[PDB]
Every structure is written in structure tokens, then in C-alpha cells.
Amino acid sequence: ATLKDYLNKRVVIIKVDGECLIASLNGFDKNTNLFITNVFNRISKEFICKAQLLRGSEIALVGLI
Amino acid sequence: MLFFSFFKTLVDQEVVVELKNDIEIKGTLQSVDQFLNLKLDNISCTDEKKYPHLGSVRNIFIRGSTVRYVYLNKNMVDTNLLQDATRREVMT
Amino acid sequence: MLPLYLLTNAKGQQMQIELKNGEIIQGILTNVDNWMNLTLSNVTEYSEESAAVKLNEIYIRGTFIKFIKLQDNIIDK
Amino acid sequence: VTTEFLSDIIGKTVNVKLASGLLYSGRLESIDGFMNVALSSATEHYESNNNKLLNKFNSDVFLRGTQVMYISEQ
Amino acid sequence: PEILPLEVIDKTINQKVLIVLQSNREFEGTLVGFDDFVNVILEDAVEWLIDRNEKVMQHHGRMLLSGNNIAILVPGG
Amino acid sequence: TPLDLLKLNLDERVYIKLRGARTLVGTLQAFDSHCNIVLSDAVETIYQLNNEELSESERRCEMVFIRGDTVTLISTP
Amino acid sequence: LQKQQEEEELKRKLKQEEDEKDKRKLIESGPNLELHEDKFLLDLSKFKIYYDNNHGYEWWDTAYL
Amino acid sequence: AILDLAKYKDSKIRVKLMGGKLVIGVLKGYDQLMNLVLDDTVEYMNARKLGLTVIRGTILVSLSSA
């Protein structure tokens, strides 16, 4: 199991608190720490960041859109 | 290492996954890892309400720490194999 | 590239940390380790994103971070 | 020293509190370095033994280690 | 001339210690022993819940308190 | 050893308490040291408190794997 | 750092790609394996130990002399 | 380690803990595991006065000066 096939692609991320993101996945490590670019709030469609680092503890789901 | 072994024999078999945050997802198990992370292909909706905000997404990665349940079919699994393997496993 | 490598080379930049309790920490990164523990200088911490304490240095455990907003400058820097 | 305790109270009657508040009174069958506990003739109570009995397990009770807040003798 | 935390806990052995969890609950008792993980053995513990605070129980004998949940130790209660 | 006295009742009916007022009854197929479980022929009871009143819900499944980290308790019904 | 390591792996992969192009060129100048051209190639050892072992005309007539 | 706690010995530090506790104390001792020895420890929950306390490093979330 690996997030390799998702690199540089757009993804949906569901956080553990049920919050939702849309972003380009650029980096990831073995603990699921993500490096993201052009992040948005799925529900809100509100631009969050041009670049952001997201802890794996926070992630519940990553989907390939 | 035992449940990693279990989940490998389930590849290509449709499973339902229940995440802690009350999300339920049907999918074909494409991939499993040491943390029990899961990759599900051909995503589909089991429950109307619990199911989250997806659509085009047909392939997902699920973090193993966030799953509560994986619902299986009794024909996907040899019970006696499971039992004798648990008996073999050492816990110390 | 890996999140940690990215952090290790953002040393000297400005960045904004969201913690698991909601507190926001704006500061300039001065050190990272392999568990993503940080130390930042020129710090301003907020009780929440709504916003204000100024601190000289802060140390943050990595297990407590939800996410870290990086400066757009990041990729080239 | 904590290990000497673990082997010192095996077979004795103990209270095992978990994170939630729930408390288990039984006889200590076994213990492991991960704090996993086995009890026999166990009852569950919330917070105190004097509170209402919530359950009596005639069978042996395995309590998970990650969850235990203390083990205490009476 | 460094003061080591575990040396401080070592000195409070056979004295009264307050042990504060990360929750409200507290344990006051006689510090019998402790290990490297800060698991802790108390003797005749008073178990508390904190704010009017209700005293949960009076233990008799010896308690092993999991150091997994311990946030603070106060020597001599 | 408490993890060995669990092998004792493999292929025997078990009762499992989980975090969140969940309860499971099933026949024990597999476990590990993480407490991870597989049960066959299982029914899961959920106690919810909505609108200030208590209801308990049910869910039946022929085979289920249970992430072990929510597991609190294992006995027999 | 990490981008330097990814640049190292990408360096190895690219070097293998250019090595593959030089391999195709070398195959164009030379024995393609898919065409089975390995079978056109002559062997001196086999026919020399054969011819010697035959006293000098085949295996047919060696019963005459 | 990335934080040199020596420069903070005998100064007043602010330590936020897991589970939402605040503690301001004077730094007397430290270890590599971030276990602290605070003096004149005041735990903010609004005010509580413990004395010479040992803080566990495993639950420590943040550390600033005061």
C-alpha cells in the first residue's frame, strides 16, 4: 500500500474531524505526513494555502480525483 | 505481522470499511500495508447518510489508524486457518 | 520531496503552525528534528485563528501539529 | 520494581481502573509488560465499588493494557 | 551541576507525592517505587477528581499507576 | 500471558467492549497483540443518547475485522 | 536534502534511460533478441570439435575408414 | 537535541501540556526526554500553586519563556 500513484495529482482529503480538503499532493512520508500545494476547503471552496504541510495523525482518507 | 497476512489474501475482494468518524465505504481491496492501510478501487456508497463528500473519486487511500471495522464475507476466509495461525502467533 | 526535507530547508523562513488545540503560531523557523519538533524565533501565538502573545522563542512538539502553512516562496527557496 | 509488584500481587484481589472511569474488581490471573490484565470473578462499577454494580462476569476478563489507568490491591 | 528529573523523583521515594494526570483526576499517596517509564507505585492512595472536588476513593495497600497518563509529579504532596 | 488465555477461547463465543458504548458478540476467529480481532457471526450493539433519551442500535455481520485500538475489554457473554 | 535524494534517484533512472537508447543504437549497429537473431551466429568451437571428432568427413562415413 | 534547555536554567518558562494544562515555573532541571523540574510552579487550568514539580516530557506540547 502506497501513495505513490497519487503524486502530483489532485486529491480529496478527509481529515479525522470530518473536515474536507482539495489539493495537489507533492510529497509524503511513511507516517502519512503530506506536502500539499494549492489547498482548498472542499465544502467551503475557500482557498487555504499555496503550500502546506499536513500531519498524518490528521488524515483519515486520501482520494484520487 | 499476522493481520497483514490476513489482509493480503483479501485482495480483489469487495469489502466494506467503517472509519471511526462514521464514514462507511464499499470497495475492491487493491492494496494493504504493514500499518493495515488500505487502498480501495471502484468506490461506492453503502449508506446514504454516513457516506462523505466524494463523487468522481473512485480510488482511495485509507489510513489504518482511522478504521474501526472491516466487514467481510464468511466465504472470503478460512476460519481454521485463522485460528491455527492465531494459536501459532507469539505475544511477548 | 519529503515533508521533513522540505521543513529542514525552510529554516529561516516564516511559517504558520496550527496545533491540535486550535492555537496558531506565527514565527520564523530556527530548527527541526526527525520527529518534526520545531523551534521558532520571532513568535506570535494566538488562542485561535479568529485573531495575541508575542514570544521570543517557542518549542513545539511535532505530535501536536495539525498542519503548517508554508510561505508561497517555498518551492524555489 | 514495578515488575516485582506485578508478580507480588498475582492471585490477589485487585481493582483495575480504565481511562473511561470504569473499574473492575477481580482476582489477578495474569499480567503482561504492556499492562494487559487478566481477572477472574470480576465485577464492573463506575468510579467506585460502592456505586451500582453494572456487571458480574462469571467468566475470565481480559482488560486491554493501553486502557488501564491503575491496578490496585485491597 | 545538572538537576535530573528522575533524581528528583528518586529523592521523593518514601515521601508523600501528589500525582496529577492529564485529566482532572489526582492521586495522593506515599511514593513506594517508580520505573524508567514513570509508572508509579503508590501506598494508600487518595484518588481525587478536580473542579468542589469529590474524593473518589481511599486505596489501601499498593497501587500501580500507569505513567502513560501522568502529567505532573509533586513531591511531598 | 493474558494474551495466551485469549487463545483459550478461540472458536468460542466472546463479548467485547469498545470505545463509545459499543458492544460486540461474536465467535473468536483471530487476534493479535494489538488486540486486533476477527469475529464471525457477530452482532454489534450501539448505545446512543439523543434527545436526552437512550436507544440501542444493532448491526449484524457474518465476518468482521476490528481495529484493536478501540478495544477496551474481552470476556464471554 | 530530500530534493537532492530525489534528484539522485532521477539521475540514476535517466542514466539508465540514455543507456537504453545507446543499447538500441548498439543493437542497430551490430543481434536483436526478439527476432531470435542469436541463432544466426556461428560457433567455431562446436564445429571444430565436431569436425575433429569426425576424423574429417562428417559422422556418416566414418565407418568406412 | 534542537532546543538547548541550559540557557533556560533559572529562568521562568511557560509549558503547555496535553489535555489543555498550562504551567509556568522556574526551570531547575531537564533531561533528553524533555522531562522538566520546575520551581514556584503555578498550574493554570484559573490559578493553582504547586511547588517543586516534575513535568513529564511525553505529554509536553509547547515551551516558551516568561
Swiss-Prot record, chain A:
MF-aspect GO terms: mRNA binding
Keyword Ribonucleoprotein: yes
BP GO terms, sorted: mRNA splicing, via spliceosome; rRNA processing; tRNA processing
Residues that span the membrane, as ranges: none
Subcellular location: Nucleus; Cytoplasm
Listed result of changing R55A: Reduces affinity for poly-U RNA ends
Record's keyword annotation contains Protease: no
Chief location of this protein within or outside the cell: nucleus
Keywords, alphabetical: Cytoplasm, mRNA processing, mRNA splicing, Nucleus, Ribonucleoprotein, RNA-binding, rRNA processing, Spliceosome, tRNA processing
GO CC annotations on file: cytoplasm; nucleolus; nucleus; precatalytic spliceosome; spliceosomal complex; U4/U6 snRNP; U4/U6 x U5 tri-snRNP complex; U6 snRNP
Sm domain mapped to chain residues: 1-65
Record-stated family: Belongs to the snRNP Sm proteins family.
General remark: Present with 1440 molecules/cell in log phase SD medium.
Function, as annotated: Component of the nuclear LSM2-LSM8 complex, which is involved in spliceosome assembly. The LSM2-LSM8 complex plays a role in the biogenesis of the spliceosomal U4/U6-U5 tri-snRNP complex by accelerating PRP24-mediated annealing of U4/U6 di-snRNA. The LSM2-LSM8 complex binds U6 snRNA terminating with a non-cyclic 3' phosphate group. LSM2-LSM8 is probably also involved in degradation of nuclear pre-mRNA by targeting them for decapping. LSM2-LSM8 could be involved in processing of pre-tRNAs, pre-rRNAs and U3 snoRNA, although involvement may be indirect.
This protein's name: LSM2-LSM8 complex subunit LSM8
Organism: Saccharomyces cerevisiae (strain ATCC 204508 / S288c)
Gene behind this protein: LSM8
Full-protein interval shown: 3 to 67 of 109
UniProtKB/Swiss-Prot annotation, chain B:
Gene Ontology biological process terms from the UniProt entry: deadenylation-dependent decapping of nuclear-transcribed mRNA; mRNA splicing, via spliceosome; rRNA processing; tRNA processing
SUPFAM superfamilies in the record: Sm-like ribonucleoproteins
Entry coiled-coil feature ranges: none
Record's GO cellular component terms: catalytic step 2 spliceosome; cytoplasm; Lsm1-7-Pat1 complex; nucleolus; nucleus; P-body; precatalytic spliceosome; sno(s)RNA-containing ribonucleoprotein complex
Superkingdom of the organism of origin: Eukaryota
Gene3D superfamilies associated with the record: 2.30.30.100
Any matching Pfam family: LSM
Impact noted for substituting R63A: Strongly reduces affinity for poly-U RNA ends
GO MF: RNA binding
Subcellular location(s) per record: Nucleus, Nucleolus; Cytoplasm
InterPro entries, sorted: LSM_dom_sf, Sm, Sm_dom_euk/arc, U6_snRNA_Lsm2
Residues of the Sm domain: 2-76
Keywords linked to the UniProt accession: Cytoplasm, mRNA processing, mRNA splicing, Nucleus, Ribonucleoprotein, RNA-binding, rRNA processing, Spliceosome, tRNA processing
Further comment found in the protein's record: Present with 2210 molecules/cell in log phase SD medium.
UniProt record similarity statement: Belongs to the snRNP Sm proteins family.
Function: Component of LSm protein complexes, which are involved in RNA processing and may function in a chaperone-like manner. Component of the cytoplasmic LSM1-LSM7 complex which is involved in mRNA degradation by activating the decapping step. Together with PAT1, the LSM1-LSM7 complex binds to osmotic stress-activated mRNAs to attenuate the osmotic stress response, probably by limiting ribosome access to the mRNA and consequently translation. Component of the nuclear LSM2-LSM8 complex, which is involved in spliceosome assembly.
Designated gene of the protein: LSM2
Curated annotation (Swiss-Prot), chain C:
Domain Sm: 2-74
Subcellular compartments: Nucleus; Cytoplasm
Residue ranges crossing the lipid bilayer per the database entry: none
Effect of substituting R61A: Slightly reduces affinity for poly-U RNA ends
Taxonomy, superkingdom: Eukaryota
Coiled coil (residue ranges): none
Note, other: Present with 3440 molecules/cell in log phase SD medium.
Chain's role: Component of LSm protein complexes, which are involved in RNA processing and may function in a chaperone-like manner. Component of the cytoplasmic LSM1-LSM7 complex which is involved in mRNA degradation by activating the decapping step. Together with PAT1, the LSM1-LSM7 complex binds to osmotic stress-activated mRNAs to attenuate the osmotic stress response, probably by limiting ribosome access to the mRNA and consequently translation. Component of the nuclear LSM2-LSM8 complex, which is involved in spliceosome assembly.
Assembly and interaction partners: Component of the heptameric LSM1-LSM7 complex that forms a seven-membered ring structure with a donut shape. The LSm subunits are arranged in the order LSM1, LSM2, LSM3, LSM6, LSM5, LSM7 and LSM4. Except for LSM1, where a C-terminal helix crosses the ring structure to form additional interactions with LSM3 and LSM6, each subunit interacts only with its two neighboring subunits. The LSM1-LSM7 complex interacts with PAT1; within the complex PAT1 has direct interactions with LSM2 and LSM3. The LSM1-LSM7 complex interacts with XRN1.
The family this protein is said to belong to: Belongs to the snRNP Sm proteins family.
Gene expressing this chain: LSM4
Swiss-Prot record, chain E:
SMART domains, sorted: Sm
Domain Sm: 4-77
Keyword entries, A-Z: Cytoplasm, mRNA processing, mRNA splicing, Nucleus, Ribonucleoprotein, RNA-binding, rRNA processing, Spliceosome, tRNA processing
One function term, GO molecular function aspect: RNA binding
Annotated compartments: Nucleus, Nucleolus; Cytoplasm
Pfam families: LSM (PF01423)
Annotated CDD domains: LSm5 (cd01732)
Outcome when changing S66A: Slightly increases affinity for poly-U RNA ends
GO CC annotations, alphabetized: Lsm1-7-Pat1 complex; nucleolus; nucleus; P-body; sno(s)RNA-containing ribonucleoprotein complex; spliceosomal complex; U4/U6 snRNP; U4/U6 x U5 tri-snRNP complex
Example GO BP: rRNA processing
InterPro entries xrefs: LSm5, LSM_dom_sf, Sm, Sm_dom_euk/arc
Annotated coiled-coil segments of the chain: none
Source species, domain of life: Eukaryota
Keyword Zinc belongs to the record: no
PANTHER family in alphabetical order: U6 SNRNA-ASSOCIATED PROTEIN, U6 SNRNA-ASSOCIATED SM-LIKE PROTEIN LSM5
Family the UniProt entry places it in: Belongs to the snRNP Sm proteins family.
Function, in words: Component of LSm protein complexes, which are involved in RNA processing and may function in a chaperone-like manner. Component of the cytoplasmic LSM1-LSM7 complex which is involved in mRNA degradation by activating the decapping step. Together with PAT1, the LSM1-LSM7 complex binds to osmotic stress-activated mRNAs to attenuate the osmotic stress response, probably by limiting ribosome access to the mRNA and consequently translation. Component of the nuclear LSM2-LSM8 complex, which is involved in spliceosome assembly.
The protein's name: LSM complex subunit LSM5
Recorded name of the encoding gene: LSM5
